Amino acid sequence: AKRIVEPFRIKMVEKIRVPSREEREAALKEAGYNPFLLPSSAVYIDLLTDSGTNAMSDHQWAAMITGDEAYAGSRNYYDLKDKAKELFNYDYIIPAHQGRGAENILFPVLLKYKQKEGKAKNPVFISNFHFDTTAAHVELNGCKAINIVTEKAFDSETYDDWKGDFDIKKLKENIAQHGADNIVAIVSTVTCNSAGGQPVSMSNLKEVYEIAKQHGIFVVMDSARFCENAYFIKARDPKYKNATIKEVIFDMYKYADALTMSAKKDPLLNIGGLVAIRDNEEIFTLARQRCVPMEGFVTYGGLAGRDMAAMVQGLEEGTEEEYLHYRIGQVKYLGDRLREAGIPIQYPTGGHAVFVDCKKLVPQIPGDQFPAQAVINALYLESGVRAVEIGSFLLGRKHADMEFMRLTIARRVYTNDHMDYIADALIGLKEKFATLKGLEFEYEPPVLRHFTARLKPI
Amino acid sequence: AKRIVEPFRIKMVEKIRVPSREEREAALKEAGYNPFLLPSSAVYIDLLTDSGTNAMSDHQWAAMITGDEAYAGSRNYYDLKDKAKELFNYDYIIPAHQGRGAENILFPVLLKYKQKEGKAKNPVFISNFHFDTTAAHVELNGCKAINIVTEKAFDSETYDDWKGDFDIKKLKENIAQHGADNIVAIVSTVTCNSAGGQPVSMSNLKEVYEIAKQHGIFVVMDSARFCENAYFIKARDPKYKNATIKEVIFDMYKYADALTMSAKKDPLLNIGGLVAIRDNEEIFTLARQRCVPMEGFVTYGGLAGRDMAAMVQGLEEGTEEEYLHYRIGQVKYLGDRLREAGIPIQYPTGGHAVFVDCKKLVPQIPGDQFPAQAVINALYLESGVRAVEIGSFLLGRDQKHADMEFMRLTIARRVYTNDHMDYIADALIGLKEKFATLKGLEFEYEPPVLRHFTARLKPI
Amino acid sequence: AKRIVEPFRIKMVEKIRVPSREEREAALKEAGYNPFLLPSSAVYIDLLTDSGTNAMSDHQWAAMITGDEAYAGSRNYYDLKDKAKELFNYDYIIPAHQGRGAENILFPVLLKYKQKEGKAKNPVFISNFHFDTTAAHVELNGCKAINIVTEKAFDSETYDDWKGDFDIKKLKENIAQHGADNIVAIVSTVTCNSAGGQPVSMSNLKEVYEIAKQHGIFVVMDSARFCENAYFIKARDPKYKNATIKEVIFDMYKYADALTMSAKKDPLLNIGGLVAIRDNEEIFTLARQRCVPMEGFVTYGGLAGRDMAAMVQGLEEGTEEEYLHYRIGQVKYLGDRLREAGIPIQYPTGGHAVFVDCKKLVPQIPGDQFPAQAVINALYLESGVRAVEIGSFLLGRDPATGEQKHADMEFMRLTIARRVYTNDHMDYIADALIGLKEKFATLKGLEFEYEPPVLRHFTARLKPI
Amino acid sequence: AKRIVEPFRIKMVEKIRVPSREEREAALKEAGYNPFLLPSSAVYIDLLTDSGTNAMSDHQWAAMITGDEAYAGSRNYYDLKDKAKELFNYDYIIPAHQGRGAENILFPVLLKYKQKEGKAKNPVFISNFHFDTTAAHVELNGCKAINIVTEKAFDSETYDDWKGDFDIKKLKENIAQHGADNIVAIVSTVTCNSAGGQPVSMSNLKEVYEIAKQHGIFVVMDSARFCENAYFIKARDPKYKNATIKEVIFDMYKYADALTMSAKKDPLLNIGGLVAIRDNEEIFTLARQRCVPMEGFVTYGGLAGRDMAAMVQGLEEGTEEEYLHYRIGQVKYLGDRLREAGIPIQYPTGGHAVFVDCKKLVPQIPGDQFPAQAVINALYLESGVRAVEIGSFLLATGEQKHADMEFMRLTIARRVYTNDHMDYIADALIGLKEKFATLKGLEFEYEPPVLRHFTARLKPIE
Numbered sequence A: 001a002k003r004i005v006e007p008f009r010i011k012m013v014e015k016i017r018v019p020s021r022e023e024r025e026a027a028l029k030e031a032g033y034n035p036f037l038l039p040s041s042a043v044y045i046d047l048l049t050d051s052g053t054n055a056m057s058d059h060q061w062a063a064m065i066t067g068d069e070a071y072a073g074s075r076n077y078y079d080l081k082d083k084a085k086e087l088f089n090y091d092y093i094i095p096a097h098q099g100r101g102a103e104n105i106l107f108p109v110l111l112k113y114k115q116k117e118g119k120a121k122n123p124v125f126i127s128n129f130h131f132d133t134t135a136a137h138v139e140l141n142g143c144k145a146i147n148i149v150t151e152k153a154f155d156s157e158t159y160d161d162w163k164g165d166f167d168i169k170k171l172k173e174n175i176a177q178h179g180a181d182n183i184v185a186i187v188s189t190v191t192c193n194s195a196g197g198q199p200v201s202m203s204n205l206k207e208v209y210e211i212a213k214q215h216g217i218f219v220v221m222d223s224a225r226f227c228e229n230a231y232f233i234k235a236r237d238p239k240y241k242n243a244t245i246k247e248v249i250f251d252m253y254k255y256a257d258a259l260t261m262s263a264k265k266d267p268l269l270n271i272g273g274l275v276a277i278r279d280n281e282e283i284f285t286l287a288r289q290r291c292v293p294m295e296g297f298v299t300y301g302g303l304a305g306r307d308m309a310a311m312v313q314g315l316e317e318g319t320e321e322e323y324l325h326y327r328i329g330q331v332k333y334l335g336d337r338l339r340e341a342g343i344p345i346q347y348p349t350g351g352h353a354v355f356v357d358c359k360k361l362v363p364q365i366p367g368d369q370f371p372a373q374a375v376i377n378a379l380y381l382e383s384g385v386r387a388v389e390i391g392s393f394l395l396g397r398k399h400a401d402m403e404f405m406r407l408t409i410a411r412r413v414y415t416n417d418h419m420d421y422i423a424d425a426l427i428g429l430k431e432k433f434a435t436l437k438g439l440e441f442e443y444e445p446p447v448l449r450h451f452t453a454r455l456k457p458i
Numbered sequence B: 001a002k003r004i005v006e007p008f009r010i011k012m013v014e015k016i017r018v019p020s021r022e023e024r025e026a027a028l029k030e031a032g033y034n035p036f037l038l039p040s041s042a043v044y045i046d047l048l049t050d051s052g053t054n055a056m057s058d059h060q061w062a063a064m065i066t067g068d069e070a071y072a073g074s075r076n077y078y079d080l081k082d083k084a085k086e087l088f089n090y091d092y093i094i095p096a097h098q099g100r101g102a103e104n105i106l107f108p109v110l111l112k113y114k115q116k117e118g119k120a121k122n123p124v125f126i127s128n129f130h131f132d133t134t135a136a137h138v139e140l141n142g143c144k145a146i147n148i149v150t151e152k153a154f155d156s157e158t159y160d161d162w163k164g165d166f167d168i169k170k171l172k173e174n175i176a177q178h179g180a181d182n183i184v185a186i187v188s189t190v191t192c193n194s195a196g197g198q199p200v201s202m203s204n205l206k207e208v209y210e211i212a213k214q215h216g217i218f219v220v221m222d223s224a225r226f227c228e229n230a231y232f233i234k235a236r237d238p239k240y241k242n243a244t245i246k247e248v249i250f251d252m253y254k255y256a257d258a259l260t261m262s263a264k265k266d267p268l269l270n271i272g273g274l275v276a277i278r279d280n281e282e283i284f285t286l287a288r289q290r291c292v293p294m295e296g297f298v299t300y301g302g303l304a305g306r307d308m309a310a311m312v313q314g315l316e317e318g319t320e321e322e323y324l325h326y327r328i329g330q331v332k333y334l335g336d337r338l339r340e341a342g343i344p345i346q347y348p349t350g351g352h353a354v355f356v357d358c359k360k361l362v363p364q365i366p367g368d369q370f371p372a373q374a375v376i377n378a379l380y381l382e383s384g385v386r387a388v389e390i391g392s393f394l395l396g397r398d399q400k401h402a403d404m405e406f407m408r409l410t411i412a413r414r415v416y417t418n419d420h421m422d423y424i425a426d427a428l429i430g431l432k433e434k435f436a437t438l439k440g441l442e443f444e445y446e447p448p449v450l451r452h453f454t455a456r457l458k459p460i
Numbered sequence C: 001a002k003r004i005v006e007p008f009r010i011k012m013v014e015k016i017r018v019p020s021r022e023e024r025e026a027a028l029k030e031a032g033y034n035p036f037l038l039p040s041s042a043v044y045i046d047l048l049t050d051s052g053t054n055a056m057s058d059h060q061w062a063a064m065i066t067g068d069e070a071y072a073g074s075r076n077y078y079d080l081k082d083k084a085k086e087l088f089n090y091d092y093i094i095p096a097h098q099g100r101g102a103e104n105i106l107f108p109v110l111l112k113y114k115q116k117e118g119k120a121k122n123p124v125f126i127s128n129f130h131f132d133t134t135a136a137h138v139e140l141n142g143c144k145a146i147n148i149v150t151e152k153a154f155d156s157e158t159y160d161d162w163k164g165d166f167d168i169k170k171l172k173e174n175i176a177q178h179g180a181d182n183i184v185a186i187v188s189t190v191t192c193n194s195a196g197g198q199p200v201s202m203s204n205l206k207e208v209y210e211i212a213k214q215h216g217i218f219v220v221m222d223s224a225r226f227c228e229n230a231y232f233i234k235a236r237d238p239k240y241k242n243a244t245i246k247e248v249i250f251d252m253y254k255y256a257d258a259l260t261m262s263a264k265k266d267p268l269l270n271i272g273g274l275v276a277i278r279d280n281e282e283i284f285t286l287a288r289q290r291c292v293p294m295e296g297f298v299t300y301g302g303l304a305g306r307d308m309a310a311m312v313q314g315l316e317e318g319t320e321e322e323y324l325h326y327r328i329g330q331v332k333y334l335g336d337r338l339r340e341a342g343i344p345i346q347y348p349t350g351g352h353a354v355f356v357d358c359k360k361l362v363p364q365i366p367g368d369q370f371p372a373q374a375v376i377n378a379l380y381l382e383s384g385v386r387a388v389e390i391g392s393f394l395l396g397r398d399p400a401t402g403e404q405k406h407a408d409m410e411f412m413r414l415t416i417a418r419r420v421y422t423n424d425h426m427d428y429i430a431d432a433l434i435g436l437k438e439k440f441a442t443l444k445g446l447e448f449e450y451e452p453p454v455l456r457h458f459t460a461r462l463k464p465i
Numbered sequence D: 001a002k003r004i005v006e007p008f009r010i011k012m013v014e015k016i017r018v019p020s021r022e023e024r025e026a027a028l029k030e031a032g033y034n035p036f037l038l039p040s041s042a043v044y045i046d047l048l049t050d051s052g053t054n055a056m057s058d059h060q061w062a063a064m065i066t067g068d069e070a071y072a073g074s075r076n077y078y079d080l081k082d083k084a085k086e087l088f089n090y091d092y093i094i095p096a097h098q099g100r101g102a103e104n105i106l107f108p109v110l111l112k113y114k115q116k117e118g119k120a121k122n123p124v125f126i127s128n129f130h131f132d133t134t135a136a137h138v139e140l141n142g143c144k145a146i147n148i149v150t151e152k153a154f155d156s157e158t159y160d161d162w163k164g165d166f167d168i169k170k171l172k173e174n175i176a177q178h179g180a181d182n183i184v185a186i187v188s189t190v191t192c193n194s195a196g197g198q199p200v201s202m203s204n205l206k207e208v209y210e211i212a213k214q215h216g217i218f219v220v221m222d223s224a225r226f227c228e229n230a231y232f233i234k235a236r237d238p239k240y241k242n243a244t245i246k247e248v249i250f251d252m253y254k255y256a257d258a259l260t261m262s263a264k265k266d267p268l269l270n271i272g273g274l275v276a277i278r279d280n281e282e283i284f285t286l287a288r289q290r291c292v293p294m295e296g297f298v299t300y301g302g303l304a305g306r307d308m309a310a311m312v313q314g315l316e317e318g319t320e321e322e323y324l325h326y327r328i329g330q331v332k333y334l335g336d337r338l339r340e341a342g343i344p345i346q347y348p349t350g351g352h353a354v355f356v357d358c359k360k361l362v363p364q365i366p367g368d369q370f371p372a373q374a375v376i377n378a379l380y381l382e383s384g385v386r387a388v389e390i391g392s393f394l395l396a397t398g399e400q401k402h403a404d405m406e407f408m409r410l411t412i413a414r415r416v417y418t419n420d421h422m423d424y425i426a427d428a429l430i431g432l433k434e435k436f437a438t439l440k441g442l443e444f445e446y447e448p449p450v451l452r453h454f455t456a457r458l459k460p461i462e
C-alpha cells in the first residue's frame, strides 16, 4: 500500500472523538442496530457517504462570502452557466438543490417529452446502473429502471479496467425488446456508483451514444462523480494518456444530450446540484417550468447564492489532476491495506469508496439475514467507524447479486492515518467474522427500511 | 411617517450602485421589458421579493461555521427538532430546502392519507389564500385550490385589523358543497401573503381549527411569515397586548396539526424550509418516505448542515419583538410616505411589503395591457428599483380578470435603511404626472404557462 | 439637515440593546463615572472612537479568508506593497499592527538619522497638530512636540475651509528659532484630528513640504484619515473640482517623504497600520531593523496575513467618492441637527466626528471640574450613548504646577465609525443631546475619587459634586 | 517511527505546490541565499516557524465572527481576563499584538521598577535561554542577557528528560557575581526554544523560583509553548502521572510572578500575545501605561476583538491532552524517521520542531561559515522545504561569536501538515546524505547590527 501526500495543507480543523465501547453499544441499540439512525455524536470516522461531507478550500469559502443572494439574476447563476459551457460545452443550465432534485426536474420532463404522439406506452429508463434515488424517480413516474452493467462488475476479485461499462449486447437487446419508442432515456452513470465507483470507458460512452442517436434516444449523463471517471480514463485509456482532465471531460460530454449532477460529490460541496442541457432548448424550457414549483426560481433552483458561488469554484478544483491523484490514491491505499490482509474487496478500487465483498467475508450469514450489515455493525462496535450497506438490507421485500459494505471516503477530510485506523479496525475482526451472526427485524417499515428500520441480532 | 431606529448596527456591507439612465434603458430592452429577466447587476434596490435576501447576524454566521455537515444525524438537526418543539409544541420535524420543497413533501402525503379508505374522489384544499407555489402543488396533485379570504381584503384604502382572515361563511359553505371527505386540508396562511401580507387574528385561526376538527379536516399552517403575523396579533388583539411574541406563536399553533415553512422569510435565512407535525406520527412517517427521493435524507432534507444551524439561530432572532417592531415599522414608513403623497396602497401595510393599488393609479390602461407592470417598468427606468406582481400578468389565462392589480414593493429583512425607503418613495412620487401619459404593454414573445417569468414584452 | 443614502446595503448585523436606566446608572457608578471604564455591554451606540470599529465589506472578509499567514514572504505583503506604490507612489512599505506601532517604528529611526552628524542636540518635531500617541512617541524619544495649527481652528463657530492648516508664519518662526538641525521631522496630520478632523489644503501641504525640502527637513504624513482629507480638497479647492479622489491622494503625497498610517480609520479595518517611505532606502533599512524587535518580521509587521489582505481591499474602498460623500455627509447631518437646535459645535464638521463645544454649552461647571465630561455622563445616563472627552479631563495636570492645565477647548467628541450606524442612529444621538437642553443648567461638576498620576482619563474614577 | 492519528478531521484546505528546481534556484539567488527573504510563493512545505501559521478550529473561527471590536471594554477582553485567572491564577492581563510586543510592554517596566531606590546600576536578565526577540529587548534597554541552560542540552544524541532546565549552580553563581540588586528578572522559557524545544521540569521551575524569591528577584515565564512543556511534565514526571494538563499548568505558574506569551504558538493563533501578572498591581499599572503608546488601549492591546475571541478559544484547545499527544507525536515521528536513517538530531525531540545537529552533518564547514545554514539552503533547493538556522548565523563584540550548537530547525506548525508531509521532509533530507560532504560555507554580503539572520544577504564561499 502506497501513501500519497496531500496537494494541500490544512487551514481549518473540526474535532472528532472516539466514543467508548459502551457508548457505541448503547448508541447502536438505541438506533435499532441501524447506523443510519445513529446521531453523528456517536460516530468517530463517518464513512456513510461521500455526499455533502467534503472539506472546501479557502477560495470556496471566499466565493461564498461574496455570493449574490438575489432571487432573480444572481451574479453566480451566470458564472455557473459560463462554467458549464466551458466544462461540458452545454448551453443551458438549471441549478438544483442537489442531485435528486435535478433528477426530479429532468426525468418527468423527459417522460412527458417522450409521451408525445402516443409513444412510451410501456416506458423504461436504461442505465449501466441507476442509483437508488435515480431509480426511485424512474419508478415514481410509472417507468421501469433497467440496469445493464457489464458482467465483469459482479466478479469482485477479478480486475477489469472498466467495471462500470454498459453491456452493449444487453443495450441492443433491450432496444429491440422494448422498442426505441418506449426508451425514455439512457442514463450513463459516471463513475458507476453502485458497481463500486467503477469507471466507464470513453469508447463505451461513445458507442452507447451512437447507438442511442441512431434510435433517437435521449442520453442523460449522471455526473455526480464525473471527475473521478475522467481521471480513470486518462489513467487507463492510452488515447488520453497525455490529455488534460478537462480535455477528457470535454470529450465525455460529447456523448450525452444532458446531465444531472449532484455537486455534493466531485465539485467538493456540502450541498448543491445542477441540470445542464447540451442544445435541446425545448427540453430546457419544460425543465424550467418544473423547476419553479419544485425547486425555486430558475436562476437559483433551491440554492443560496453563496452555494452557486461555491459550486463555480469547486467545479474547477474538482478537475485538478494533482488532487484527483491523491484523492483516488487514498481510496486505493485503504483498499490495498485490506487486500494485503486478505480482506476481499471490489478490485480494482473505484474513485470514492472501498467496497468490501461481505458475501465471501461472512458466508455463514445468508442474504436475507443481511451479512454486510452484520459486518458494518461489528465494525462500528469495535471502532466507532460508520459504514453503509449495499446489499440485501438495501432495497428489500428480495435477493441481491452483491453484498458490499461501502467504506465511503469524503473528499479532503481524512488523512491516511485515518485510513490506517479504518483498515486496522476491520483487520482486527478477522477472527470474529466466522462466529458472526445475522440480523432480523424488530420494526420494519413498509418501504425504505434501510434508512429507518430497526434490527436485532439473531 | 415615523422612522424607527435599527435595533442593531451594521457589521458587514455589500456594494450596490445605480446604473445610468442609458444602462437602465438598454438593460430593460435586453430583458424584453420584464424585470424578472433582469440580471442583478442591472438593479439598484431590489424589491422583487423578501425571500432569501435577508441579512443574517454574526451569530447566524457563527452557527454556520460550526455546522455539522453529516449525512445522517447532524447535530443541528436535533437542535432544530428541539427548537420546533419549543416554539410550536410540535413533536416531529422534516427539514426541506425551502418552502415549496416543504409543500412538495407534505401535500401529496395528505392527499394519499385522505384517500386511504376510498374517499376524497374530488379532492380540494381550502385556504384564506394559497400562495402561488402552494396552489401549484395542490393542482399538480389533481386537487383544486379554493381561496376564501375576507371581503375586507378587497377594499384597499379602508382600514381593517385582520385583512388576512378566513371568510368563515365561505368556509362553512365550501365544506357543505364539496363535503368534508373531499377536503384534503385547510391551509392557514400567516400572514396572508396574497392579501397584502395581512394578518390573521387568533380568534379567526381558532374558529377555523374548531370547524375543521368537528369535521375531521387536517389543518396546515403556512408559516413563512408567522412572526410578522404574531406581531400583528400582539399589536391589535387586546387579549395578547401584554403577551410575548413567543406566547402568541405558541397559541397560534394550537390551531393547526402541522406547518410548512419557508425559512427564507421570517427566520432571516437565505435558504431553508421546514415541515413540522404536531403529533400525527403516521403522516410524519409518510412525509419522511417522500422526503427521501424529493429532498434528501430525513435529517438534513436538502440543506447543508450549516443552513440548519443558521435556521436554529434565525428562528430565535425572528421572534424578537424589538426587531419585529423595526421591521414592520419600516414597511409602514414606506407606506405612510406614499399614502401621504396620495399614492393608493393596501391599507394598513402588511408585514413584509407595500402593495401599491395600480387599478386606481393608472386607470387609462386596461388590465389586459398590464397596468401595474407599466408602473414597475417606469419605476425601474426612473430609479433602478425592481418590483414585482401585476395581478393580471401573474393571474395569466384560463386572461382571467384580477380582483386586484397590485405592485409589490417587497422589503428584505435588515438589508435597507429608511434612506433607501425615502429613495423608493421619492422615485414613485416623482412619477405622479407621468402615470397619465403611461403606455400599456403587449407581448413580443409570450410563453404559455408562467408568462410573468420569461415573457419578452414591448411598449404599446 | 440633509440625509444621504447609503451606497451599499447591509449584509450582516450585530445586535445592540439600550440598557435600562437602572442598568446605566449602576454601570456608570461601577465605572467611577468614567465611560472609558464601562464595558461595551453597558453601551448602546458607542461614539468613543472611529478607530477599529468600522464595518468591513464582503470583499474584505473574502480577502481575509484566503489570506496567506506565512511568517516570511506572505502573498498579501506584496499586494500591500503594490497598493502603496499605486496610491502614494511610495516605493517601500513596512506593515505595523496599528498606527502607534507605525510611529514606534519610524519616529525613533528619524531621530537617530538626524543625529548622524552630531545634529539634533535639542531635537523637536513640528506638526500642524500631533495626535496623542504621536506626541507621546515624540516625547518618549526625548524630543519636544510642537503644534502650529492655524488660529482659525480655535474659533469654534467661525467657518473656515481649512481649519487643519499649518500656520506658515509659525513654521518659519520655529525653523529659525530651533534651527533646521534640531527639527527631526515635520508631521502633516491629514485630516487634523485634534483640530476636529479638519482638512489641510493641498496648497498648505505643498508650501510646508517646499519649506521643509529647502531646509533638508524630513516630512512624515500622518495618514489615518487621508481619504477624508482628500474628499475635502476636492469639495473646497477649485483646482481639484474635477479630479478623482485617487488623483487628489496622489498629489497629496508628493508633499511628504514618508507616511505613518492607522489602517483602523479610512482603510475601514478593525486592526492594522502601515509605514510607507517614498524613496529614502537608508531610512527604510533602519526602520526595518526596528520593526523586527518591536512589531514582527518585515513582511507582516505584527499583523495576521488576513489583516494585510483586508487592508489591500480597504485601501481601495476607502477612496471611493460615493462612500466618502455618504460618510462625511452623515457626520455633517448629525452636526446640522445639533446646530439647528442651538447646540454649539466645531463648524464646519470634520470628516469623522462632531465636536460639541461644551465651553459655550455649559457655564455653571468650570474647566477644572470637567464640563465636557459632565455632559458626556448626562448623555450616557439619558441614552446609553458613549462619547469621549477632549478637554480638561484629557489634558490632565501639569507636573510643574501639580495642578490642572488650562484647556483651550472643552469638546465632547461624537466619533462616528464607518458604515456602522444609520442616519436613524444619528437622530437618536442628536435627540438625546437636544433633550438635555433644560437639564444642562442644573448639571453638577465632577471630582476625583481616584486619580492616577499619568494618563488619567483612561482609568481615573470620578464622583459627582 | 510511529504515526499518531489526528484527533480531528479537515474542514478547510489551502493549496500548496512544489516550485520547479529552476524556480527555487532563481528564488534563492534573489533571496541572497537567506530563505527568510524567500516569498511564500517559492516555498512548498514551510518549516520556517511554528509561529502564527497554525490551523484554527471551526470554534475559533466562529468566535472571531462574533468578536466584539469595541475600543474600550470589549466582551472578549473580560473573557480573556477570566481565562488567564482560570489557567494561571493570575489577576491581571494586558493583551499584546504578539510575543515581542508583550516583552516590549513588560521588560522596560521591570527595569524601571528595579531601579527604584537607585539599584540595578549594572542590570541583567537571567534565563535558561532567552529567545532572540527576548534578548533583543533586554539589550535595547541597556541590560545584559545571561543564558544558563543545562549542559545536558549540549549533548545532542544523549537522551535526557529535561534538556531545557536551568543550570542551578550557574543561577546561584550569577546571582552572587552580579548581585540580586542587579537582576531585573529571571526569565523561565517553557519550552526552552533555543535548546531544541526541550522541557523544563517542574522541580527545576520550583527551585528557580524559590531561589529567586529569597533574593527578591522577579520571575517572568516566557510562555509561548507552555502547553507543550506541561505535556512533557505529565509524560516524564511520575508525580504528575494522574494529573490533568491544567493541573500541571496551574502548578507551573505558581513558580513565576508574571508571564509574557506569544499566543501565536500553543494557543493556536495566527496573531496575538498576552501579558499576565499574578498579583503585583504596581507593575500592572506601569505596564498598562507603557501599553497605551506602544500597543493600544489596555482592553485590546493591539489586537482586533476577533483575535482576542480566538485566543480565549485557542487557550482552551491548546491544553487538550489528545491534541498535545498528537502534536508532539508528529514531531517525534519526523525525528525518529531522521534518527532511524542516521541523521543526528537533538534527542529526544522537543515540542514544536526537530533540531538537526549540523555540526555533525557537515564537519568540513566551520561554525563561522554557517554550516547549518548550508544544510538549509541545500534542503530548499532539493525539495522546496524552507527551514531556519539556529547556530552561528543566528548568534570586539562584532567578531563571530562561538556557537555551542549548530542546528537546522524543522519547525512544525500546529494542525497544518500530515504525516505524509513529514515523510516528504524526511525523505528529502535523508536524500542529501551523499551531498553533505560537498557543501560549502557562506559569507555575508549585508549584515544588520542586530538580529542579522532575519534580513541579511549571503553568498556561497565555494
Ligand SMILES: CC1=C(O)/C(=C\N=C(/C)C(=O)O)C(COP(=O)(O)O)=CN1
Binding pocket: A048, A049, A050, A051, A098, A099, A100, A101, A131, A133, A134, A189, A193, A222, A224, A225, A261, A262, A263, A264, A272, A273
Ligand atoms: C450516481 C448518483 C449518486 O451517487 C447520488 C447520490 N449518492 C449518494 C447519496 C451516495 O451515498 O452514493 C445521486 C443523488 O444525488 P443527491 O444525493 O440527491 O445529491 C445521484 N446519482
Ligand SMILES: CC1=C(O)/C(=C\N=C(/C)C(=O)O)C(COP(=O)(O)O)=CN1
Binding pocket: C048, C049, C050, C051, C098, C099, C100, C101, C131, C133, C134, C189, C193, C222, C224, C261, C262, C263, C264, C272, C273
Ligand atoms: C491622527 C492619528 C490618529 O487619530 C490616531 C488614532 N486616533 C484615534 C485612536 C482616535 O480615537 O482619534 C493615531 C494612532 O493610530 P492607532 O490608534 O495606533 O491605530 C495616529 N494618528
Ligand SMILES: Cc1ncc(COP(=O)(O)O)c(/C=N/[C@@H](C)C(=O)O)c1O
Binding pocket: A296, B048, B049, B050, B051, B098, B099, B100, B101, B131, B133, B134, B189, B193, B222, B224, B225, B262, B263, B264, B273
Ligand atoms: C406564504 C408562502 N408560502 C410558500 C412560499 C414558498 O416558499 P419558497 O419556496 O419560496 O421558499 C412563499 C413564498 N413567497 C415568496 C416566493 C414571495 O412572496 O416572493 C410564501 O410567501
Ligand SMILES: Cc1ncc(COP(=O)(O)O)c(/C=N/[C@@H](C)C(=O)O)c1O
Binding pocket: D048, D049, D050, D051, D098, D099, D100, D101, D131, D133, D134, D189, D193, D222, D224, D261, D262, D263, D264, D273
Ligand atoms: C520563546 C519565545 N519567546 C518570544 C517569542 C516572540 O514571540 P512573537 O513576537 O514572535 O509572537 C518567540 C517567538 N518565537 C518564534 C518567532 C520562532 O521560534 O520561530 C519565542 O519562541
Ligand SMILES: [K+]
Binding pocket: A051, A052, A053, A270, A271, B069, B070, B071, B303, B304, B305
Ligand atoms: K452536507
Ligand SMILES: [K+]
Binding pocket: A069, A070, A071, A303, A304, A305, B051, B052, B053, B270, B271
Ligand atoms: K437567496
Ligand SMILES: [K+]
Binding pocket: C051, C052, C053, C270, C271, D069, D070, D071, D303, D304, D305
Ligand atoms: K477593533
Ligand SMILES: [K+]
Binding pocket: C069, C070, C071, C303, C304, C305, D051, D052, D053, D270, D271
Ligand atoms: K500569521
